[PDB]
Design a protein around this ligand. Structure first.
Ligand SMILES: [Mg+2]
Ligand SMILES: [Mg+2]
Ligand SMILES: [Mg+2]
Lengths: 139, 483, 201, 50, 71
RNA sequence: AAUCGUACCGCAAACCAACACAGGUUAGUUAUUGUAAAGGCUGUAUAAAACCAGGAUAAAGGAACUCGGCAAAAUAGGUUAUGUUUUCG
């Protein structure tokens, strides 16, 4: 079994394409796997739950092993300690999405600006050729 | 004031500082380095260099039990050092003494050779040699209130928050207060020196050796054991020939070892080194000579001290003695013998509490490093080896290592039945049958030994035991029968 | 690739304060011949901006900034214009354009200006003596010349110590705390690989 | 102040205050159940479901 | 909120800065096996006695951590 | 290793107010120097009445207004040699 899933339909992830379960509009972390349009029953199930936005460097994380070492011995403090650890894990899923959305926005803006420069260059070159023809025609 | 589009710099200084302090992976470091390496001031450029050696070790430890390190990382680690090395040279003229220490150490620690840095360090070492070895020299002061125009070029004061600084009262009667700073820089110059910068590095070090030898005073706080080792290896690597300087350096090491033993009372407990205990404070950090009690803070999550050793330890004795073997010809025999005896006394006293033996844990790498120096120096002593064997675990060692250890103990005339039994018992449990004897692998050696190789290891162990004179036991009898 | 004005005396600068076009006809003609003839003006000059309008402006600022770093004393805008043109050639046309670049540097603390001392506000307003500009080797967080920056830092340092101990006395943390937000996702990992490929190439 | 918000729903409160287990715990509650059986109401308690 | 009353628990990546080894040592040019055999044979079989040891010897004690002064 | 929750709304046109109600509704997180990344949202067709509501400007005078400086306006901030009163803070 792999640790992370690698085959995602990126049109579905960004939002241009509908999912395999259109009734679900905002998948949960454990619902992403079965909402993927490229779902297959032959692929082995990953051993951990990650969203499509997670980086490939998360395969070396072991969070519950560290939690046990930090476990307080007083049950009253232990319950609150565990509650904050679960809060930390859930928030980490939505930090990845925010970074994912900001990172893609910068790449899109760069590409759009580059196209704008090329279009103006072609228009100016075409006009210059037309201007030259006018002078040549008039001798 | 810093709102809008900056036509000169792509990233604001304050934001760049935030990213540097927020680094935990090499990929994140590569993202920052490959984009804004040309806009870092000396404070930012040197901070990245110090972190990189630690980030490389962290990733090697992130690998789980059944995984392996990504092969693309080590090439990237050296790629980032080279890029930062170039920027270090560009801003080298605006660094402080402390900043130069950070940048030089990072490259030397990573064993990355850079001609540009070596040439820059060579000129700096010459300038600092005549200033830091002067008798009328003052310690470096971090309490700056109104910086000079040249201090504004270091980038320390371009901050929107409080700048941490040491709160200690600087000594006013210290001799050569910055000797440790000079020793580290010289060692880095030797290590970072390349093929085209070797001549310049050697010339600068030779002048330092002559100045060091022609000195009639000793620093009031004696140089740390780590600094002494670094300076000794700076001469050894560079090939500097100066018996006067070499002898003086070993004299300081001898003096420090005696002082530690003189001021030790065995009734208190096993010998331990003197260290500097650094704690976090409101305005920065404070250094103490003795530890505090454990404390619970309402705001800090960690109140533990940073321990910076000053006296010698087994780790440093294996590096100082290594340098001595390289520089044997330049050291009088009398001084070498005195240091060797002091080293044995330091080891014996560090693992004894009250009237009973209390072994101190050591690793196999450390033991081999110490023994290798002794073999080169031809020093045989049972008071230095016996403490090392008691504190050495013998559960994960290969069969070959156990055989070598038994031979070493016999040659050093170690007389302890417990040590011999712990070795033969471990060796017997690793010698398996099938009709071919197989010797298991382990930390000590790579691979397994089968057939004659296993028999040879058994014969050597039996020969060592027979010379030692151990009474017959089950473990030895089984080994003899198999071999 | 600087272009000359129709008078063939200077180059046009990329900013909104430039009221002169770029001559672009295939043949060189005096202004008086074609300006009053009645022909369309777009046949002789280009009144628009270049496709690289933003990139050119950034390059010009770096040239001005680097030249100031090489200077050892504050100088006038006229000296800056002559020095840059001599070093690289005819690339800047007016002192007003250089002033606009300097204002951006002043705002972000990449440069500083030395102002005279006047006895009354009205004398200061009516004064016409040119100003002197310098440059910071690295970006700072305080305004003014290096002497002024040092004074401002000293006041700031005292305030920081005052605030930290007041917080401790009133049972607050001496130093504010936050949580570390993870800003490394799959997009960032792919950007790093792209960066290495470009650097290798 | 604006009035008319005297109902603040709570599922645990509703079951504990008017549930079948509560009505069967006292003699008066048992009499209430009989009265509702006599009148022939289809739902006896707010707590009832199939 | 954004403002914490104390340091957050160590749930993020923790980079360790303890016990960093960067010292220089000798090579691995040790003696050959045959040389060791010759040395052992040359050892005189001195009939000495063993030292008087305590009946129970405690196991090795771990060493305390160390840092560097390049802060 | 079984069992129950997992769709959608959740400062709201979906919950409490008879309503697609300018009201009420707990906790956790995020960008931003003088600003502000991500994400989210969107109004039948005109105009040169009186009058009403919420703003802006105003010559000379400056409380003459009125039960009443109601409302509106106003250098509003910081450091002071000296003096007064104190329960001495
Ligand atoms: Mg949902
Ligand atoms: Mg008026
Ligand atoms: Mg009146």
């Amino acid at each position: 079994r792999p640790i992370m899933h690698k085959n995602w339909d990126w049109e579905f992830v960004v939002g241009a394409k509908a999912g395999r379960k259109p009734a679900i509009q905002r998948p949960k972390p454990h619902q992403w796997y079965y909402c993927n349009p490229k779902y297959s029953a032959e692929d082995p199930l990953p051993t951990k739950i990650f969203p499509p936005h997670a980086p490939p460097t998360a395969e070396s994380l072991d969070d519950w092993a560290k939690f046990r070492k930090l476990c307080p011995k007083d049950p009253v403090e232990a319950k609150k300690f565990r509650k904050h650890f679960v809060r930390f894990l859930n928030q980490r899923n939505y930090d990845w999405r925010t970074a994912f959305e900001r990172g893609l926005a910068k790449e899109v803006a760069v590409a759009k600006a580059a196209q704008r420069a090329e279009d103006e260059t072609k228009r100016q070159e075409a006009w210059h050729a037309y201007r030259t023809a006018v002078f040549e025609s008039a001798l | 004031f810093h709102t809008g589009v900056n036509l000169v710099q792509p990233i604001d200084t304050s934001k760049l500082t935030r990213q540097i302090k927020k680094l935990t992976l090499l990929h994140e470091a590569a993202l920052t380095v490959l984009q804004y390496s040309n806009y870092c001031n000396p404070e930012q450029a040197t901070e990245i260099l110090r972190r990189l050696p630690f980030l490389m070790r962290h990733e090697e430890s992130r690998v789980l039990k059944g995984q392996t390190l990504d092969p693309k990382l080590p090439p990237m680690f050296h790629g980032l050092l080279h890029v930062m090395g170039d920027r270090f040279v560009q801003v080298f003229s605006d660094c402080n003494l402390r900043q130069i220490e950070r940048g030089a150490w990072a490259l030397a620690a990573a064993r990355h050779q850079h001609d540009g840095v070596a040439l820059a360090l060579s000129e700096k070492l010459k300038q600092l040699t005549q200033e830091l070895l002067d008798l009328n020299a003052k310690p470096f002061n971090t309490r700056v209130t109104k910086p000079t125009p040249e201090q504004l070029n270091s980038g320390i004061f371009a901050s929107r928050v409080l700048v941490p600084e040491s709160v200690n009262q600087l000594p006013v009667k210290a001799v050569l207060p910055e000797f440790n700073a000079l020793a580290g820089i010289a060692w880095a110059l030797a290590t970072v020196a390349g093929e085209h910068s070797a001549a310049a590095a050697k010339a600068a070090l030779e002048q330092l050796a002559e100045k060091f030898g022609a000195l009639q005073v000793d620093p009031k706080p004696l140089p740390d054991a780590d600094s002494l080792c670094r300076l000794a290896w700076a001469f050894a690597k560079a090939g500097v020939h100066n018996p006067a300087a070499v002898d003086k350096l070993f004299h300081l090491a001898e003096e420090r070892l005696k002082s530690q033993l003189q001021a030790h009372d065995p009734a208190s407990g096993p010998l331990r080194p003197r260290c500097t205990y650094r704690y976090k404070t409101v305005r920065g950090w404070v250094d103490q000579h003795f530890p505090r009690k454990p404390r619970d803070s309402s705001y800090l999550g960690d109140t533990a001290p940073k321990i910076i050793p000053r006296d010698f330890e087994i780790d440093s004795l294996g590096s100082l003695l290594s340098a001595a073997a390289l520089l044997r010809d330049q050291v009088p025999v009398e001084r070498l013998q005195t240091i060797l005896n002091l080293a044995a006394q330091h080891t014996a006293a560090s693992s004894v509490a009250g009237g009973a033996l209390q072994p101190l844990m050591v690793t196999y790498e450390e033991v081999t490093r110490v023994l290798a120096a002794c073999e080169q120096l031809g020093f045989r002593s049972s008071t230095l080896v016996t403490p090392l064997l008691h504190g050495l675990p013998m559960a994960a060692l290969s069969a070959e290592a156990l055989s070598q250890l038994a031979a070493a103990a016999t040659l050093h005339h170690v007389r302890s039945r417990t040590v011999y039994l712990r070795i033969v018992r471990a060796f017997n449990a690793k010698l398996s049958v099938s009709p071919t004897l197989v010797a298991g692998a382990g930390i000590g050696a790579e691979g397994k030994k089968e057939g004659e190789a296993a028999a040879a290891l058994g014969a050597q162990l039996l020969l060592a035991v027979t010379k030692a004179g151990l009474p017959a036991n089950a473990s030895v009898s089984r080994i003899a029968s198999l071999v | 690739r600087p272009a000359l004005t129709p008078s063939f005396s200077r180059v046009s600068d990329p900013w909104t304060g430039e009221k002169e076009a770029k001559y672009a006809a295939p043949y060189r003609i005096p202004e008086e011949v074609w300006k009053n003839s009645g022909a369309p003006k777009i046949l002789f000059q280009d009144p628009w901006n270049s496709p690289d309008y933003d990139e050119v402006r950034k390059k010009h600022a770096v040239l001005v900034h680097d030249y100031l770093k090489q200077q050892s004393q504050p100088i006038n805008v006229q000296t800056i214009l002559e020095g840059v043109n001599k070093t690289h050639g005819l690339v800047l046309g007016t002192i007003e354009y250089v002033t606009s670049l300097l204002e951006n540097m002043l705002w972000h603390d990449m440069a500083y200006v030395v102002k005279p001392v006047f006895s009354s506000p009205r004398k200061a307003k009516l004064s016409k003596i040119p100003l002197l500009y310098g440059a910071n080797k690295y970006q700072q967080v305080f305004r003014g010349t290096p002497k002024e920056v040092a004074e401002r830092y000293e006041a700031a340092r005292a305030k920081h110590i005052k605030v930290a101990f007041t917080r401790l006395r009133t049972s607050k943390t001496p130093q504010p705390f936050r949580r570390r937000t993870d800003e490394y996702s799959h997009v960032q990992a792919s950007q790093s690989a792209l960066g290495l490929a470009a650097a290798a190439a | 102040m604006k009035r008319g918000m005297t109902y603040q729903p709570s599922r645990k409160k509703r079951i504990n205050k008017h549930g079948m287990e509560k009505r069967l715990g006292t003699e008066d509650g048992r009499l209430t159940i009989l009265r509702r059986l006599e009148k022939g109401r289809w739902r006896l308690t707010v707590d009832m479901f199939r | 909120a954004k403002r914490l009353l104390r340091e957050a628990p160590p749930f993020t990546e923790q980079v360790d800065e303890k016990n960093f080894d960067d010292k220089d040592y000798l090579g691995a040019g040790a003696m050959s096996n045959e040389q060791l055999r010759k040395e052992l044979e040359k050892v005189e079989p001195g009939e000495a006695k063993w030292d008087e040891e305590s009946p129970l010897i405690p196991p090795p004690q771990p060493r305390q951590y160390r840092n560097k002064g390049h802060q």
